Q: What sequence folds into this?
C-alpha cells in the first residue's frame, strides 16, 4: 500500500518535510541525516541525481512504536545506487514502524515505487516402509503431458517420489488416445521411458487405463467409428491386446485399470449410455465391459485386472451397481481380480462407516480392494455447503482436519481389507501445486488453487496430511492435533 499510511520521519535532529503521493508511489526530500518515510504495521526505489551526488546511503529500518530504540543492521550504500531493488530482513510482539531514511549528508529526493514483505515436518523417513503388510504405497505422476511436472524432467518430483513411494500410476500418458492416437499406430516411447524409470527405482507400475469413456482421450477413430458393432468390438480387443502384451513383455507392470468409470452417476445407477462411445459404438451395449476383461486376461494371465471408479465408496446407488456387476461377472466366469476405489473424498463426506461398508462388499466377494486415486479436498463444491464455509487461504485448522481425514481413510482400508486382499493405496499426485482438482473445479473455485488435497505442499514440503497417513499405517490414534 503506497497510497495510504505513509509518513515523514526524522531519526536525527534535522526535521523532515513529510511525503508526496504520486502515480510513482511515495517521495520524500532527503533533507538531512535520518530524514525518511515510514508506514505502520523488499522495496523498489528511484533516487534523484542530487541524491547520488550527495554520497548518502539509504537505510531500510524498523522500530517498535513508543519503544523507539529497539533493526539498525540494514544499509544500501551510495555506490549501489544509480529504479532499484532494495531488500531488508525480537520481531514478534502483541505496532511496528517501518520505512527507509537517508544517511550521511544527503540532498535531492527518494521515490519509493513498491514495498512487499514476506517449516513443518511430518518426521516420516519413507512412507512406504511403514506399511504393516507388503502392499503398494503409490502415487500418480505427470509425464510428457506436463512440461512443468514431468517426472522425468522435474528433479523435485523425482526426489519426493523416490523418498516415499514404491508404486506409480501415469496421470495421462497410458490413457487410450495417448497409447493409440490413430488406428494401428501405437505409441509406447514415453510410457516405456516412465516404466524404465520405475524399474530403475524398484517401483511397480499400475496401468491406467485400458478402456475409459472420457472424450478427450478416446481415440478419434473410435469416437468417430462408422463401421459395424462387431468390428468396433474387434478394434477394442486389438487396442487392449497390443498394449497388455507389450507391457507384459516390458516387465514391472503389475495391474491394470481395465475399465474405468463405466457406471453412471444416477440413482439408481446404470452403465453409461449416450455419454460413452463404447456403449454407442458397440451397438448400444455394455458387452464391451466384460469383453475387455476377457481380452486383457487372455493377453497376460498374470496381470491383475481392476474395475476402477469414483463414488463407489459412498455406499449408495453406484456401490450397488458395482457390486451387482461384480456378482454377475463371477456368476458368468468373466475374469476380474479387484475393484479400484478412486477415493476422491471430501473432508467430512462420505462417512468412514460407509466407505468401510462399500470396501467390505468387495472383500466378501473374495477380490482385491485397491485405493487408486486418493485425495482429500479442503474445498470441493459438492461438499460442506460450498461456498458457504469456503476456506481461503489455507489454515492450520484445515491442514489438521486433513491429517485426521487421511488417517481415518487409511485406517478404514487396513481395518476392512485383509492382508492378502490389499491391492495398494495410491494418492493422486505429489504436490498441491499440481492437483487435478483445481482444474476440475476451476469454475466453482473462481480459478483459485484451493483444493490443497495432497500430502505435500506447493514447495514439496510435508503437510500434516503425510503425518496422518503414516499414523494410520503405524496404528497411532487418528487426530486433528499435532
Ligand atoms: Na513395490
Ligand atoms: Na501375451
A:
Amino acid at each position: 500500500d503506497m497510497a495510504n499510511g505513509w509518513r515523514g520521519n526524522a531519526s536525527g535532529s534535522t526535521s523532515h518535510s513529510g511525503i508526496t503521493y504520486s502515480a510513482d508511489g511515495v517521495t520524500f526530500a532527503a533533507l538531512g541525516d535520518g530524514v525518511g518515510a515510514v508506514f505502520d504495521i523488499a522495496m523498489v526505489v528511484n533516487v534523484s541525481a542530487e541524491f547520488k551526488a550527495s554520497e548518502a546511503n539509504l537505510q531500510i529500518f524498523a522500530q517498535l512504536k513508543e519503544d523507539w530504540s529497539k533493526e539498525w543492521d540494514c544499509l544500501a550504500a551510495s555506490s549501489e545506487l544509480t529504479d532499484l531493488t532494495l531488500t531488508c530482513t525480537k520481531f514478534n510482539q502483541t505496532d511496528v514502524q517501518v520505512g527507509i531514511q537517508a544517511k550521511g549528508t544527503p540532498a535531492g529526493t527518494i521515490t519509493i515505487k513498491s514495498v512487499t514483505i514476506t517449516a513443518y515436518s511430518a518426521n516420516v523417513d519413507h512412507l512406504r516402509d511403514l506399511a504393516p503388510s507388503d502392499f503398494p504405497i503409490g502415487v500418480a505422476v505427470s509425464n510428457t503431458d506436463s512440461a512443468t511436472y514431468n517426472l522425468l524432467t522435474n528433479s523435485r518430483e523425482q526426489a519426493v517420489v523416490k523418498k516415499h513411494f514404491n508404486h506409480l500410476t501415469a496421470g495421462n500418458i497410458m490413457k487410450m488416445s495417448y497409447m493409440q492416437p490413430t488406428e494401428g499406430n501405437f505409441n509406447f516411447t514415453n510410457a516405456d521411458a516412465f516404466v524404465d524409470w520405475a524399474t530403475e527405482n524398484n517401483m511397480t507400475v499400475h496401468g491406467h487405463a485400458l478402456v475409459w469413456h472420457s472424450d478427450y482421450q478416446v481415440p478419434n477413430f473410435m469416437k468417430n467409428w462408422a463401421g459395424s458393432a462387431e468390428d468396433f468390438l474387434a478394434a477394442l480387443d486389438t487396442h487392449i491386446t497390443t498394449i497388455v502384451d507389450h507391457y507384459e513383455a516390458k516387465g514391472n507392470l503389475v495391474s491394470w485399470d481395465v475399465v474405468n468409470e463405466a457406471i453412471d452417476d444416477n440413482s439408481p445407477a446404470n452403465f453409461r449410455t449416450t455419454d460413452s462411445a463404447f456403449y454407442v459404438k458397440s451397438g448400444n451395449s455394455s458387452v464391451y465391459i466384460e469383453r475387455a476383461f476377457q481380452t486383457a486376461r487372455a493377453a497376460d494371465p498374470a496381470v491383475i485386472l481392476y474395475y476402477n471408479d469414483y463414488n463407489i465408496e459412498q455406499n449408495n446407488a453406484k456401490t450397488t451397481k458395482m457390486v451387482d456387476m461384480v456378482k454377475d461377472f463371477q456368476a458368468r466366469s468373466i475374469p476380474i481380480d479387484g475393484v479400484g476405489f478412486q477415493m476422491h473424498v471430501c473432508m467430512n463426506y462420505p462417512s468412514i462407516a460407509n466407505i468401510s461398508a462399500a470396501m467390505k462388499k468387495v472383500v466378501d466377494l473374495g477380490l482385491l480392494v485397491k485405493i487408486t486415486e486418493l485425495d482429500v479436498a479442503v474445498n470441493q463444491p459438492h461438499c460442506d455447503a460450498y461456498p458457504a464455509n469456503k476456506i481461503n487461504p489455507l489454515t492450520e485448522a484445515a491442514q489438521l482436519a486433513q491429517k485426521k481425514r487421511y488417517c481415518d481413510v487409511v485406517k478404514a482400508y487396513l481395518d476392512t481389507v485383509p492382508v492378502n486382499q490389499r491391492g495398494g493405496i495410491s494418492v493422486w499426485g505429489t504436490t498441491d501445486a499440481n492437483t487435478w482438482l483445481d482444474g476440475l473445479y476451476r469454475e466453482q473455485f473462481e480459478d483459485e488453487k484451493i483444493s490443497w488435497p495432497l500430502l505435500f505442499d506447493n514447495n514439496y514440503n510435508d503437510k500434516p496430511a503425510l503425518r496422518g497417513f503414516a499414523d494410520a499405517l503405524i496404528g497411532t490414534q487418528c487426530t486433528n492435533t499435532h
